[PDB]
Design a protein around this ligand. Structure first.
Ligand SMILES: Nc1ccn([C@@H]2O[C@H](COS(=O)(=O)NC(=O)[C@@H](N)Cc3ccc(O)cc3)[C@@H](O)[C@H]2O)c(=O)n1
Ligand SMILES: Nc1ccn([C@@H]2O[C@H](COS(=O)(=O)NC(=O)[C@@H](N)Cc3ccc(O)cc3)[C@@H](O)[C@H]2O)c(=O)n1
Ligand SMILES: [Cl-]
Lengths: 417, 413
């Protein structure tokens, strides 16, 4: 029972007619879908949970359809968003569409027979639909009375100053129609998404019933919450390495709290529930701190960034920890400059004293002198006690980088020129 | 000032930026519009007041655009309507568009130089507009918070069972964009309509600022009211239509004759081109109901229509029918007097029973014997009487009267 398995991982927030759906799943393979709107040039961890759920359905023999919102990204989903978003250009949305389609593709199997993945784009049907056709054939089935009371938009109707345009208000109908379209095109009978998408999903179930007279289902995945109450992925943790480096991504998982690590293994990895429970039991019964954060970091970094990406994240982690930077490549230093450690700009010939001031590692030049004399500053992991020390020509790695460290953990990469 | 002249006729319910509109009108000809949606095969008396206002503006040198809602008629205006309307088909709406366009045309001048009237149809811009273009280019300028606060839809936003669909809720944007579209195509700077249209007009004014950076104005006419509080133009038969096949010229003329004294002077101002000074002079007296009937019947049905209405009224008052044509008896059969279809050979007693002028043959006999019945205006007091063939006028009609006023037209099969 796939639904029961997903429930056991904590991956089911809500599900329409659970018995009929589980009966349909047990009968044989179904076609299902999840949509992703292009509101940026990359997906982030928030999007990864339902994307991996598409893969979990596919592993059970079901056929996943990953829709990219070519049309809906030109409209804007207001679902649980406090403010109206500016419209993006057709040109920008198209660029993002191609980037998101290409980022999604490696997470699903496009070559496993009858249940092979499908890439879809709702611009295929909205790009040539007339307004009167939309208002009549689709709009007649929506009650504004019900629409204005939906949890996803109700708060936007409290104050006109923090209101909702007719454009964003119409979004719910567009997503509704997509479900009817995919049902007609591929026999899609299930739509999945994060919990904020419930209302957009249920509109699609109801519309499919009115237009195609078919029974379809919805299933939502919970929005990720931390046990301490703070906002998840607040450092967004992007999937694109040029937005969030494999090193920053790996470190994000390493620093998961003990209260979140087992839930996160369930949500973000393909480890069996038995292996995750064995790992939790081992951490519970070992007289030591948990090791689960290391397993989670390895699993998700390999999944998103491959073995190359995981090996770079570990190599960088190792070199920063050990102090020895000889193993680091220029590409590894580029990850550090991007987002791995705080970084600053400085011209070659600088004394160790002045490097510490602009990096915000020291308040003044007078303080810098005593901190060097106390043998508290390292240059590329080598202890340097001389206050009057100037960096050697071999110390500027790839003629552009030097890693400053004050104490055990305060870093600043200097990007030379 | 044309605005002040409309105000003294009581034709101004609301007007936007009034001092600026008055100054724009005084400077020279403007282009203005009023829209009419196809929800029937004919307009009715409710549509006449804004239609005549387009003519009032054209007489002052302005250029009227009479819009027929080929696209909006496929959507449905919910403004101050208690319930959701069923959608009409594209084929039905198109038939009605052509009928309404043809009905409107004689009221305006399409051949008077620069200010010649224009027939417009919003299907010309919405019939092919892409949904994403409409949602982005138009819908982004509309606040749902403002829309739900429009007076026209407040009664529909409290209970789902007396609710509003997304289709009817979008209507306000279509009418809003028509004003922007006409401003761009023709330099239209004013929209007029009944007072129920205020919210739809103001959305168009706002949208025109947002889209074209142009200042445009709105003016509404009051919804015609009756002093006694009852609905205007609601007769026993229903609405008072402009189409003579729905409401005969005679029935039309009689509706106006029977206007209450408390309404007649106000109605002369709304429905006629008589000067305000003459109406006020007429009030000093009444001839007003006859003047109102003559003016509005001539305006809607022409001189022929008015003459037919007067000739029928006179023949029915006098009982003398020789002046009636077969077309006049057709008006009587349609809606002029009660009518009954009968097989030839029926006796006078049976015609009285079948027409419900009498409850039984026995009673009919006494009523005939009492000299209460006329056949084509001639007394017939023989209770055993059978109609003569010559009494079937045009081989088809025989008008019966019981007492001095109860008519029934027999239409022979
Ligand atoms: N922090 C977050 C952010 C997003 N998500 C989930 O990720 C998925 C993609 O997020 S999204 O791109 O913002 N999605 C939307 O805006 C959806 N309206 C996209 C869409 C769905 C179906 C369709 O027919 C057309 C379009 C959705 O299922 C969200 O619920 C999430 O789970 N947690
Ligand atoms: N009893 C009545 C009935 C109608 N009217 C007035 O007659 C005019 C036509 O009536 S109507 O056909 O119901 N009008 C509508 O539905 C308008 N929404 C038609 C319309 C206007 C502008 C536009 O760009 C597109 C469409 C409108 O101005 C009404 O306010 C009136 O004054 N009294
Ligand atoms: Cl006879």
């Amino acid at each position: 029972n796939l639904i029961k398995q997903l429930q056991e991982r904590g991956l089911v927030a809500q599900v329409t007619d659970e018995e009929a759906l589980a009966e349909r799943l047990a009968q044989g393979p179904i076609a299902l879908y999840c949509g992703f709107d292009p509101t940026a040039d990359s997906l982030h961890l928030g999007h990864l949970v339902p994307l991996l759920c598409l893969k979990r359905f596919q592993q059970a023999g079901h056929k996943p359809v990953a829709l990219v919102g070519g049309a809906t990204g030109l409209i804007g989903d207001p679902s649980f968003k406090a403010a109206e978003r500016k419209l993006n250009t057709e040109e920008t949305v198209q660029e993002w569409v191609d980037k998101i389609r290409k980022q999604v593709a490696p997470f699903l199997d496009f070559d496993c027979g009858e249940n092979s993945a499908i890439a879809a784009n709702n611009y295929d049907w909205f790009g040539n639909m007339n307004v009167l056709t939309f208002l009549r054939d689709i709009g007649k089935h929506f009650s504004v009375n019900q629409m204005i009371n939906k949890e996803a938009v109700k708060q936007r109707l409290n104050r006109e100053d923090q209101g909702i345009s007719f454009t964003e208000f119409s979004y719910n109908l567009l997503q509704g129609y997509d479900f009817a379209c995919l049902n007609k095109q591929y026999g899609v009978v299930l739509q999945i998404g994060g919990s904020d998408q419930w209302g957009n999903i249920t509109s699609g179930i109801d519309l499919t019933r009115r237009l195609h007279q078919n029974q379809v289902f919805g299933l939502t995945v919970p929005l990720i919450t931390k046990a301490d109450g703070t906002k998840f992925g607040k450092t967004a943790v992007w999937l694109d390495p040029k937005k969030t480096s494999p090193y920053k991504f790996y470190q994000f998982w390493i620093n998961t709290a003990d209260a979140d690590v087992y839930r996160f293994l369930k949500f973000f990895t393909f480890m069996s529930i038995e292996e995750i429970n064995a790992l939790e039991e081992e951490d519970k019964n070992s007289g030591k701190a948990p090791r689960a954060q290391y397993v989670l970091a390895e699993q998700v970094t390999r999944l998103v960034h491959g073995e190359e990406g995981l090996q770079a994240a570990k190599r960088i982690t190792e070199c920063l920890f050990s102090g020895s930077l000889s193993a680091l490549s220029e590409a590894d230093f580029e990850q550090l400059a991007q987002d791995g450690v705080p970084m600053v700009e400085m011209e070659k010939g600088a004394d160790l004293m002045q490097a510490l001031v602009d990096s915000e590692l020291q308040p003044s030049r007078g303080q810098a002198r005593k901190t060097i004399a106390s043998n508290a500053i390292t240059i590329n992991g080598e202890k340097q006690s001389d206050p009057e020390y100037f960096f050697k020509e071999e110390e500027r790695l790839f003629g552009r980088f030097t890693l400053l460290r004050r104490g055990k953990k305060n870093y600043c990469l200097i990007c030379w020129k």
